[PDB]
Design a protein around this motif. Structure first.
Motif, PDB file in Angstrom:
ATOM      1  N   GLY B  90      10.398  -1.546  -4.392  1.00 40.56           N
ATOM      2  CA  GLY B  90       9.105  -0.923  -4.581  1.00 40.56           C
ATOM      3  C   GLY B  90       8.446  -0.796  -3.220  1.00 40.56           C
ATOM      4  O   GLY B  90       7.597   0.055  -3.004  1.00 40.56           O
ATOM      5  N   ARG B  91       8.857  -1.656  -2.295  1.00 43.84           N
ATOM      6  CA  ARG B  91       8.349  -1.645  -0.931  1.00 43.84           C
ATOM      7  C   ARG B  91       9.503  -1.380   0.022  1.00 43.84           C
ATOM      8  O   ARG B  91       9.892  -2.251   0.799  1.00 43.84           O
ATOM      9  CB  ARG B  91       7.698  -2.988  -0.601  1.00 43.84           C
ATOM     10  CG  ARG B  91       6.329  -3.195  -1.234  1.00 43.84           C
ATOM     11  CD  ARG B  91       5.228  -2.807  -0.270  1.00 43.84           C
ATOM     12  NE  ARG B  91       4.408  -3.951   0.117  1.00 43.84           N
ATOM     13  CZ  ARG B  91       3.483  -3.919   1.069  1.00 43.84           C
ATOM     14  NH1 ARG B  91       3.260  -2.796   1.743  1.00 43.84           N
ATOM     15  NH2 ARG B  91       2.786  -5.011   1.352  1.00 43.84           N
ATOM     16  N   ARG B  92      10.053  -0.175  -0.040  1.00 47.18           N
ATOM     17  CA  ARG B  92      11.236   0.137   0.744  1.00 47.18           C
ATOM     18  C   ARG B  92      10.850   0.242   2.215  1.00 47.18           C
ATOM     19  O   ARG B  92      10.541   1.323   2.715  1.00 47.18           O
ATOM     20  CB  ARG B  92      11.906   1.424   0.255  1.00 47.18           C
ATOM     21  CG  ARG B  92      11.563   1.831  -1.181  1.00 47.18           C
ATOM     22  CD  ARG B  92      11.974   0.793  -2.227  1.00 47.18           C
ATOM     23  NE  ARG B  92      13.369   0.393  -2.095  1.00 47.18           N
ATOM     24  CZ  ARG B  92      14.375   0.933  -2.774  1.00 47.18           C
ATOM     25  NH1 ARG B  92      14.148   1.908  -3.648  1.00 47.18           N
ATOM     26  NH2 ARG B  92      15.613   0.495  -2.577  1.00 47.18           N
ATOM     27  N   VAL B  93      10.857  -0.901   2.897  1.00 47.29           N
ATOM     28  CA  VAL B  93      10.447  -0.979   4.293  1.00 47.29           C
ATOM     29  C   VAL B  93      11.444  -0.228   5.145  1.00 47.29           C
ATOM     30  O   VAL B  93      12.639  -0.294   4.892  1.00 47.29           O
ATOM     31  CB  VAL B  93      10.395  -2.438   4.782  1.00 47.29           C
ATOM     32  CG1 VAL B  93       9.872  -2.505   6.205  1.00 47.29           C
ATOM     33  CG2 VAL B  93       9.534  -3.272   3.858  1.00 47.29           C
TER      34      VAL B  93
ATOM     35  N   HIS C  28       3.444   5.813   0.784  1.00 46.58           N
ATOM     36  CA  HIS C  28       2.010   5.693   0.680  1.00 46.58           C
ATOM     37  C   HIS C  28       1.497   5.229   2.032  1.00 46.58           C
ATOM     38  O   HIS C  28       1.887   4.166   2.519  1.00 46.58           O
ATOM     39  CB  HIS C  28       1.639   4.720  -0.439  1.00 46.58           C
ATOM     40  CG  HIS C  28       0.213   4.827  -0.883  1.00 46.58           C
ATOM     41  ND1 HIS C  28      -0.847   4.582  -0.038  1.00 46.58           N
ATOM     42  CD2 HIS C  28      -0.329   5.138  -2.085  1.00 46.58           C
ATOM     43  CE1 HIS C  28      -1.981   4.747  -0.696  1.00 46.58           C
ATOM     44  NE2 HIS C  28      -1.694   5.084  -1.941  1.00 46.58           N
ATOM     45  N   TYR C  31       0.293   1.985   1.045  1.00 51.21           N
ATOM     46  CA  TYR C  31       0.917   1.215  -0.033  1.00 51.21           C
ATOM     47  C   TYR C  31       2.426   1.407  -0.161  1.00 51.21           C
ATOM     48  O   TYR C  31       2.933   1.566  -1.271  1.00 51.21           O
ATOM     49  CB  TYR C  31       0.266   1.545  -1.377  1.00 51.21           C
ATOM     50  CG  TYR C  31      -0.760   0.540  -1.844  1.00 51.21           C
ATOM     51  CD1 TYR C  31      -1.173   0.512  -3.166  1.00 51.21           C
ATOM     52  CD2 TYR C  31      -1.323  -0.375  -0.966  1.00 51.21           C
ATOM     53  CE1 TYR C  31      -2.113  -0.403  -3.607  1.00 51.21           C
ATOM     54  CE2 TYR C  31      -2.267  -1.293  -1.398  1.00 51.21           C
ATOM     55  CZ  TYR C  31      -2.657  -1.306  -2.719  1.00 51.21           C
ATOM     56  OH  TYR C  31      -3.596  -2.221  -3.147  1.00 51.21           O
ATOM     57  N   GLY C  32       3.132   1.394   0.966  1.00 53.26           N
ATOM     58  CA  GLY C  32       4.585   1.467   0.974  1.00 53.26           C
ATOM     59  C   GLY C  32       5.189   2.559   0.108  1.00 53.26           C
ATOM     60  O   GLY C  32       5.019   3.739   0.400  1.00 53.26           O
ATOM     61  N   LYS C  33       5.884   2.138  -0.951  1.00 53.78           N
ATOM     62  CA  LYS C  33       6.597   2.993  -1.923  1.00 53.78           C
ATOM     63  C   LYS C  33       6.500   4.522  -1.828  1.00 53.78           C
ATOM     64  O   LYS C  33       5.410   5.099  -1.867  1.00 53.78           O
ATOM     65  CB  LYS C  33       6.200   2.593  -3.342  1.00 53.78           C
ATOM     66  CG  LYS C  33       7.116   3.132  -4.420  1.00 53.78           C
ATOM     67  CD  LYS C  33       6.954   2.334  -5.700  1.00 53.78           C
ATOM     68  CE  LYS C  33       7.634   3.023  -6.860  1.00 53.78           C
ATOM     69  NZ  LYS C  33       7.660   2.154  -8.065  1.00 53.78           N
TER      70      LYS C  33
ATOM     71  N   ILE E   3       3.105  -3.316  -7.081  1.00 51.01           N
ATOM     72  CA  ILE E   3       2.985  -2.097  -6.257  1.00 51.01           C
ATOM     73  C   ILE E   3       2.774  -0.761  -6.988  1.00 51.01           C
ATOM     74  O   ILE E   3       1.783  -0.081  -6.750  1.00 51.01           O
ATOM     75  CB  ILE E   3       4.121  -1.952  -5.213  1.00 51.01           C
ATOM     76  CG1 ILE E   3       4.008  -0.596  -4.518  1.00 51.01           C
ATOM     77  CG2 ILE E   3       5.492  -2.099  -5.860  1.00 51.01           C
ATOM     78  CD1 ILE E   3       4.488  -0.592  -3.099  1.00 51.01           C
ATOM     79  N   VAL E   7      -0.540   1.592  -7.065  1.00 49.98           N
ATOM     80  CA  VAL E   7      -0.576   2.935  -6.497  1.00 49.98           C
ATOM     81  C   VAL E   7      -1.104   3.950  -7.513  1.00 49.98           C
ATOM     82  O   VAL E   7      -1.935   4.792  -7.176  1.00 49.98           O
ATOM     83  CB  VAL E   7       0.801   3.380  -5.956  1.00 49.98           C
ATOM     84  CG1 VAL E   7       0.737   4.819  -5.458  1.00 49.98           C
ATOM     85  CG2 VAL E   7       1.272   2.451  -4.842  1.00 49.98           C
TER      86      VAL E   7
END
Lengths: 151, 138, 100, 208, 125
Positions: B90-93, C28, C31-33, E3, E7
């Motif tokens: 969900g947080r694909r860095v 984002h 907000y990452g994703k 997350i 969003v």
RNA sequence: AAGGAGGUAAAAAUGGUAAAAAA
RNA sequence: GCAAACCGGAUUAGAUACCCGGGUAGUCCACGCCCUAAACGAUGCGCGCUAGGUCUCUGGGUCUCCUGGGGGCCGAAGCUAACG
RNA sequence: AAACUCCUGAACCCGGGACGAAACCCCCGAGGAGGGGACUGACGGUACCGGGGUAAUAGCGCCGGCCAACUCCGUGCCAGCAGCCGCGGUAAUACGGAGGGCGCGAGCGUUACCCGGAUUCACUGGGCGUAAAGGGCGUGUAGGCGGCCUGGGGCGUCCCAUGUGAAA
């Protein structure tokens, strides 16, 4: 030649059948100024009693201090349940920028450049505890080389 | 099931670390192999090999421990302090060059997969190539 | 240059012109994703040669009429019954949200 | 204005003396040795528990008060100190000590702060040619504090230059009892002029 | 909120309310007034406090107070709508100033002359 | 028969009385 | 049979209530309509990992045992501000 | 600290005195490059340079803890301060006055407005057993995300080049 640096005093009453009986709690921190510390709360009817006994518990509840110039060798996010002490490295001349108990304990460790933020419950008891365990969880290059060599 | 056999691995790791049990198993994959490669490769785990259970290929991992001190209980300290799965599904860095953490500001390690393979903080910055930020460990 | 884009064909239904659902995506800025995003454009089809799905790379050209922008230069593929199905499914779930 | 008046009433206020006024506040009391301790109806009435923050503030004061200027511009140049590069604290100290007035004083021309600042704003000092008033003038490595031409034929200027000959100047204070000048040399340190003050106190404080 | 949901939705900004609608950006106003009275703060007081209703130059009948002892104020004064409630008079909001068009402080005041009127106590001696 | 826990039956003629408060 | 509401009775200072005598709605049968709650494990769902000691209910095995699935308690590590 | 002492010398008197302006222009050369001469100050005789020389304005908040600083009479839950918690109900360190002191000083307080502290809408950086919170529960649409192995793709992603991102 340590240092009995008292932090504060607590006053704890229990409701006597015919009144109320307070008792002194002596939050004390003991140092040395170069890099050894200990923590102790005093438990006694009159003030000095608590102060001394506390100082003495601080005397036996000891811990070392790894200093580089006068700072931390990393960044710790330590959390004694309630409280949450957080330390982060700073350059010389910065000063000892910290909270109450943070800068007190750490100046009894004699830090010089430490960025510190304190979160959550700011309750001085658990603050002292969290702090003590933050520096009791202080890793350095040396300790790294021990385990990160492999036994 | 599973959404991250990687983070699940990291978790089973955290188990054996926090429970002090010499070795622990975790299923077949090339990527876990790359990671645990990095892990031994910086003196952290005790090793890995392509084993099997019931007829299913697995990847077992032995791990490292410190000295047994006295006083406050016998509990020896950990070597693999903590690892945190950064780039969740969900947080694909997606770190690059001037990006990249410093992990415990100086020591630790970053695990990150780039254009070429699975790198580390110091490595990937030295390389000059970047990608996804897997876990952190120190 | 002149910006182009691929995209899933929707509605042959207009005479000598079709619509095309284009897709972009982006994370984002705080907000990452990454996020999937739909955006239909005017697929210009002088010789009506695209139908119900026909993924084509579509061309931003001189204005043709009311919002009539974009065109087509080349095709990708056919019979996108799946993605188009999802399109019509969305339209259905739209025809299932009354306030009256 | 810059306070003035009951000065070495400050001397006693800190708990440490500060020449500040030469001659006498340098003699058998900077208002001290007679009756030294913080002034007032209180003063010598059992010292208390000033919080860490309190003696911290006090350190800040103390410092600005030995540096006969406003805590205003003390602060301002502190901002200027953490502004540019350098070891925040010791460099801050230096930046204070580099100001024209204390340079003129420690050179020997003056016998302490108030007199000094008076002389300095009286443009009696010529650095590399020009007579400058502008007391908060910090010079530079490669400059030189001089005295005016008619300010050579001057009373207690001469008296100063007389009761000075033999009193060794600072290592960055170059003296010239001949050309009547004073080379602004390197850039001094807490070891050059150690004043009863901690740097990190004033820093930690000001930088709240 | 994982997350995704974060969003899709949003964590809304607190907003305020202004516990002090002096309004327009005008906490300084022409307090016309009406009545005086007394009123009491909880269980341990009893005093005066006015009511100055004000009308500003925009509205409201508020509860304009006063900077304390030494009064006149009658019914106009231009009671300078100011700001600050306490445990007294269910309002105490938008205080008075003394000086304004009226009041000009305590007959003889030696401190809070920054609202309590009196100029510069030159006893001419 | 030790404790602790898990579900079944026991056991109140009646009560109004306030309060700024003192440490 | 039961039983709110409703009446008698006794009780109290009062009894529109608990205790007693009757008695209705309703509790049952089918269709429909409403859709609420301490709907309470106050703990969402799916998986994988991390001590064992036990009481018991069902599935498999020659079975003083093991093993799949569940259902009470305890207590490693861990977690929690605490009970847990 | 004052007074007494000596010194220096803001303000102020006289004098000189700007940079700000060398081009445009006519002229020798060709009307080009170059070269010459000449005009051009609103401020203002202000900046400033020299000399003569007088000690020559001091306030504003506070002194209960936060937040550094107390003693004295009065006042008597009255007059009243008060951002918060409260302080006073006849011995108030919080009101009002007076000595002192903390701060700040040509400024000090007051309100208003905004950001912080507020990790107190949490991305860094929160939570749903009992303080705020599981939807009474099963169904599934979309959407959200997804197990092992190979190879293509190179959209997301990484890297170096690069246009532009004016000035401030």
């Amino acid at each position: 030649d340590f240092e009995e640096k008292m932090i504060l005093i607590r006053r704890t009453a229990r409701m006597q059948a015919g009144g109320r009986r307070f008792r002194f709690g002596a939050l004390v921190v003991v140092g040395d100024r170069q890099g050894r510390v200990g923590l102790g709360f005093g438990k006694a009817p009159e003030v000095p009693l608590a102060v001394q006994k506390a100082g003495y518990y601080a005397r036996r509840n000891m811990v070392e201090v790894p200093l580089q110039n006068g700072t931390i060798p990393h960044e710790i996010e330590v959390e004694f349940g309630a409280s949450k002490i957080v330390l982060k490295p700073a350059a010389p001349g910065t000063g000892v920028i910290a909270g109450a108990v943070p800068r007190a304990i750490l100046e009894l460790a004699g830090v010089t450049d430490i960025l510190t933020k304190e979160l959550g419950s700011r309750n001085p008891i658990n603050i002292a505890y969290a702090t003590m365990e933050a520096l009791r969880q202080l890793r350095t290059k040396a300790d790294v080389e021990r385990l990160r060599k492999g036994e | 099931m599973l959404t991250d056999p990687i983070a699940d691995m990291l978790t089973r790791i955290r188990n054996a670390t926090r429970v002090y049990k010499e070795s622990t198993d975790v299923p077949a994959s090339r990527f876990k192999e790359e990671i645990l490669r990095i892990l031994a490769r910086e003196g952290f785990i005790k090793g890995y090999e392509r084993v099997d259970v019931d007829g299913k290929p697995y990847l077992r991992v032995y791990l490292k421990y410190g000295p047994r001190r006295q006083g406050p209980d016998p509990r020896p300290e950990q070597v693999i302090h903590h690892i945190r799965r950064i780039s969740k599904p969900g947080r694909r860095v997606y770190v690059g060059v001037k990006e990249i953490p410093r992990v415990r500001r100086g020591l630790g390690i970053a695990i990150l997969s780039t254009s070429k393979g699975v790198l580390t903080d110091r490595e990937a910055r030295k390389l000059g190539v970047g990608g996804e930020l897997i876990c952190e460990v120190w | 240059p002149k910006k182009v884009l691929t995209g899933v064909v929707v509605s042959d239904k207009m005479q000598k012109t079709v619509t095309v659902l284009v897709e972009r995506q982006f994370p984002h800025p705080l907000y990452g994703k990454v996020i999937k995003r739909s955006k239909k454009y005017l697929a210009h089809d002088p010789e009506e040669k695209y139908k119900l799905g026909d993924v084509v790379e579509i061309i931003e050209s001189r204005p043709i009429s009311k919002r009539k922008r974009f065109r087509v230069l080349r095709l990708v593929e056919s019979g996108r019954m799946d993605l188009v199905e999802k399109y019509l499914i969305r339209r259905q779930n739209y025809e299932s949200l009354s306030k009256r | 204005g810059r306070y003035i008046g009951p000065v070495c009433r400050l001397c006693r206020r800190e708990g440490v003396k500060l020449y500040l006024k030469g001659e006498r506040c340098y003699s058998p009391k900077c208002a001290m040795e007679r009756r030294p301790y913080p002034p007032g109806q209180h003063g010598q009435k059992r010292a208390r528990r000033p919080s860490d923050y309190a003696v911290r503030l006090r350190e800040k004061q103390k410092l600005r008060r030995i540096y006969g200027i406003s805590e205003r511009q003390f602060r301002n140049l502190f901002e200027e100190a953490s502004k540019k590069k350098g070891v925040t604290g010791s460099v801050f100290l230096g930046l204070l000590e580099s100001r024209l007035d204390n340079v003129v004083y420690r050179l020997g021309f003056a016998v302490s702060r108030r007199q000094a600042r008076q002389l300095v704003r009286h443009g009696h000092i010529t650095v590399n040619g020009r007579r400058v008033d502008l007391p908060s003038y910090r010079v530079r490595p490669g400059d030189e504090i001089a005295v005016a031409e008619k300010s050579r034929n001057l009373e207690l200027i001469r008296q100063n230059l007389e009761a000075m000959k033999g009193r060794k100047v600072g290592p960055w204070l170059s003296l010239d009892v001949e050309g009547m000048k004073g080379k602004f040399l390197r850039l001094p340190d807490r070891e050059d002029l150690a004043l009863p003050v901690n740097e990190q106190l004033v820093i930690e404080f000001y930088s709240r | 909120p994982t997350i995704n949901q974060l969003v899709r939705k949003g964590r809304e900004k607190v907003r305020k309310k202004s516990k002090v609608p002096a309004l327009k950006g005008a906490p300084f106003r022409r307090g016309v007034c009406t009545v005086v009275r007394t009123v009491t703060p909880k269980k341990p007081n009893s005093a005066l406090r006015k009511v100055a209703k004000v009308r500003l130059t925009s509205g409201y009948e508020v509860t304009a107070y006063i900077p304390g002892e030494g009064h006149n104020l009658q019914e106009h004064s231009v009671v300078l709508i100011r700001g600050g409630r306490v445990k007294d008079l269910p309002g105490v909001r938008y205080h008075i100033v003394r000086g304004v068009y009226d009041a000009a402080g305590v007959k003889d005041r030696k401190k809070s002359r920054s609202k309590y009127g009196t100029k510069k106590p030159k006893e001419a001696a």
